[PDB]
Amino acid sequence: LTPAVTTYKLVINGKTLKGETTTEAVDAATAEKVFKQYANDNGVDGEWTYDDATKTFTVTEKPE
């Protein structure tokens, strides 16, 4: 693994906010964790994953 400190980006697409924020992480997991805490606080998390369509992360409200 590569224990490097990198910065990543996150976009939210809910019925609350439709903007973007960013965070710092070590690996994929770290990023996911900080972003989740934030998204929880906000009140979103239906489709909560990663985006490979402009190196971003995404929390959309499209549940099944």
φ, ψ of residue 29 to 5 degrees: the values are -55, -55
For residues 22 and 49, the answer to whether their CB atoms sit within 8 Å is no
φ, ψ of residue 26 to 5 degrees: the values are -100, -60
DSSP secondary structure code for residue 46 in this structure: S
Residue 24, token pair as written in the block: 């710092």
3-state secondary structure 2-34: CCCCEEEEEEEECCCCCCEEEEEECCHHHHHHH
Domain total for the chain? 1
Q: Report the CATH number that the domain containing residue 54 is assigned in CATH.
A: 3.10.20.10
